[PDB]
Amino acid sequence: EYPTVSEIPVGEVRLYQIADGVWSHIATQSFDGAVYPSNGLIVRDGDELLLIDTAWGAKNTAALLAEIEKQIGLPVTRAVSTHFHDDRVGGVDVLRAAGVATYASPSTRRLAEVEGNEIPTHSLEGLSSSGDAVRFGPVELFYPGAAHSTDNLVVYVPSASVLYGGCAIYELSRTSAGNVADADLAEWPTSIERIQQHYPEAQFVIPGHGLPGGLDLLKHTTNVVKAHTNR
Amino acid sequence: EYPTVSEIPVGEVRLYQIADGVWSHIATQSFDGAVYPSNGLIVRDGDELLLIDTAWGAKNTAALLAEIEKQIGLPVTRAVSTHFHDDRVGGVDVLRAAGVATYASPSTRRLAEVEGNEIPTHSLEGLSSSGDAVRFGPVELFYPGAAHSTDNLVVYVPSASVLYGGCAIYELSRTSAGNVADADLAEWPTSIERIQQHYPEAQFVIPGHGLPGGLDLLKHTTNVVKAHTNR
Ligand SMILES: [C]=C([C][C]1O[B+]([O])([O])C2=[C]C(Cl)=[C][C]=C12)C([O])=O
Numbered sequence A, B: 001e002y003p004t005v006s007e008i009p010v011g012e013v014r015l016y017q018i019a020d021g022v023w024s025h026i027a028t029q030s031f032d033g034a035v036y037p038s039n040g041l042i043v044r045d046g047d048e049l050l051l052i053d054t055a056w057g058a059k060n061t062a063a064l065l066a067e068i069e070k071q072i073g074l075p076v077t078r079a080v081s082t083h084f085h086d087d088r089v090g091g092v093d094v095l096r097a098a099g100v101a102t103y104a105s106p107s108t109r110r111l112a113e114v115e116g117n118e119i120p121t122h123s124l125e126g127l128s129s130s131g132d133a134v135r136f137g138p139v140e141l142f143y144p145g146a147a148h149s150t151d152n153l154v155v156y157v158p159s160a161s162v163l164y165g166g167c168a169i170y171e172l173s174r175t176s177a178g179n180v181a182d183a184d185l186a187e188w189p190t191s192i193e194r195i196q197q198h199y200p201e202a203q204f205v206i207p208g209h210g211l212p213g214g215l216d217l218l219k220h221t222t223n224v225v226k227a228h229t230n231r
């Protein structure tokens, strides 16, 4: 059922309904001569929508907004970027130009600025220490500690028991680390433990890239990260 | 009009005519949650065809045989695999069942056996020392030294000035290294130099994955491999 990377031509965006008022968005991008999929989230908040993460670049994010208008027809009023890399903030300027209020932690905003990446406008408070959680509209934002990056956040949708791990969680078909230049390999498994402890009831776990599954995606990612550490 | 990874569904194979009696074949496959294109070669040999490399797996290789019959209509009678990895030998059993004489160096055959990969039946002698070259019908086979793998061969078609580099040569769009667990990073640039020195006349250079170019692909690959060495 879930759209796979093979089925999505680069430039177009698919929406996958997970529960009442909860969708993922799936886009693709060419990167180093291979095509990667990328996930984000859409969560209904009253008669508006909350967006988690861009669709990886300005072109895709413009298509995301148009696909939301076509299929859902409620306004995206706020968006959160879960860390500073280009697949999560690339497209923030498109969102801002369309009237979406964009948000990230102060750590993400600073790292995006240093990297020369697009910078969400608003700063999320209350997420500065490992284990911090804050409610943001219909989701909980959680900072589990440093992992894929030092600033990475995860997002939980309580009404649907949906956990979106971002790039800190790998899909099962991924057996080797992705980019780790900005990672804290030493803390990544502990941070994953924090997620497990905080969201043990999660039923649907979405990685940054690829197919969702259950909570075993967390242990899978730990296994891959530890294998890379010992490599 | 060279087909790119975005234009080929997994399971389908495209042929690209380079010259009289010379084609590349292009397929795609998912690996670690990304989709990659992959190239091989077809060279006319009288009223028969010589195949260089499978189409990365049994399903793609059967499609490759169907596409050759449809677009060319000459029988593939021999095939050469340019190293032991699955994108070069995956499908050899399909070839053999169809009556193709499959060949690889003894080095490639030993490594495929160790790895659990399909093993081409016949052995190419005369390719065990760096710099060795042997004529094989309408191509020359060349062992440049260890690079992407210890057994990697390159293939030159003198009638068309086509050099097929396999996985030892990267396309321009690839600015970071692929799999290097089996590589000899220390020797890889020296091996590429041997290719340059032996085939300075090459006009059309084909990497193992992605778009062909000129001999600048050799300098490009050296740049990438040295950058990887230093990180
Ligand atoms: C799958 C990936 C790659 C993906 O995830 B990421 O590291 O946040 C990023 C950044 C950019 Cl610029 C492009 C692609 C990506 C990974 O690093 O785990």
Ligand SMILES: [C]=C([C][C]1O[B+]([O])([O])C2=[C]C(Cl)=[C][C]=C12)C([O])=O
Residues within 6 Å of the ligand: B031, B036, B085, B086, B087, B088, B167, B177, B178, B179, B180, B209
């Ligand atoms: C582009 C690649 C990947 C490709 O190249 B390869 O390393 O020969 C291989 C093996 C398997 Cl099993 C799957 C995919 C590939 C690289 O390593 O340079």
Ligand SMILES: [Zn+2]
Residues within 6 Å of the ligand: A083, A085, A148, A149, A167
């Ligand atoms: Zn990232």
Ligand SMILES: [Zn+2]
Residues within 6 Å of the ligand: A087, A167, A208, A209
């Ligand atoms: Zn990512």
Ligand SMILES: [Zn+2]
Residues within 6 Å of the ligand: B083, B085, B148, B149, B167
């Ligand atoms: Zn290989």
Ligand SMILES: [Zn+2]
Residues within 6 Å of the ligand: B087, B167, B208, B209
């Ligand atoms: Zn390859």
